[PDB]
UniProtKB/TrEMBL annotation:
Residues represented out of the complete protein: 36 to 210 of 301
Highest taxon of source: Bacteria
Classification lineage: Bacteria, Pseudomonadati, Pseudomonadota, Alphaproteobacteria, Rickettsiales
Protein name according to UniProt: Uncharacterized protein
């Protein structure tokens, strides 16, 4: 309903990594780039180890150095669920994509890129024909599923969905 009729809600793994798995699936369909959910967590670990800019330390917090070190361990655990505002921003920067989240609350559209998170308004309308936007749906909390495009899915993938 809050998306065009060629899009559908896919399935994500439910071991705590649904954010990473939803991002991975939309990334692969949109750009062809295959990255495992574990590799996406490792990209966030590496971001935190490599002189991260202040937005990141500000978001997750001397005390800063231990907090970053705790993050580098915790982000590799499936128990740590991913957050579009933090891990999504890191992955948008690495993969040169914009992340569109459909949030239920009515449906609100958020767009995240390497510079942070904004509501999709008149100047930042969601573009469902842009191969550099990836799409996920957030039913509540930090629960995510990929929003995929039938036009870009194999017939077998679509039968597995049905």
């Amino acid at each position: 309903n809050p998306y065009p009729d060629n899009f559908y809600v896919g399935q994500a793994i439910g071991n705590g990594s649904c954010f990473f798995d939803s991002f991975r699936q939309s990334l692969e369909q949109q750009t062809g780039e295959q990255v495992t959910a574990e590799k996406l967590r490792n990209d966030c670990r590496e971001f935190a180890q490599k002189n991260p800019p202040k937005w990141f330390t500000n978001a997750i917090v001397q005390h800063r150095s231990e907090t970053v070190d705790n993050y580098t361990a915790d982000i590799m655990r499936n128990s740590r669920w991913g957050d579009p505002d933090v891990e999504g921003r890191i992955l948008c920067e690495k993969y040169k994509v914009k992340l569109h989240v459909i949030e239920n609350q009515l449906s609100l559209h958020e767009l995240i890129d390497n510079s942070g998170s904004k509501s999709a308004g008149e100047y930042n309308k969601v573009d469902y024909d842009d191969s550099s936007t990836v799409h996920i749906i957030n039913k509540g909390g930090l629960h995510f599923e990929p929003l995929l495009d039938r036009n870009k899915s194999s017939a077998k993938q679509l039968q597995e969905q049905e």
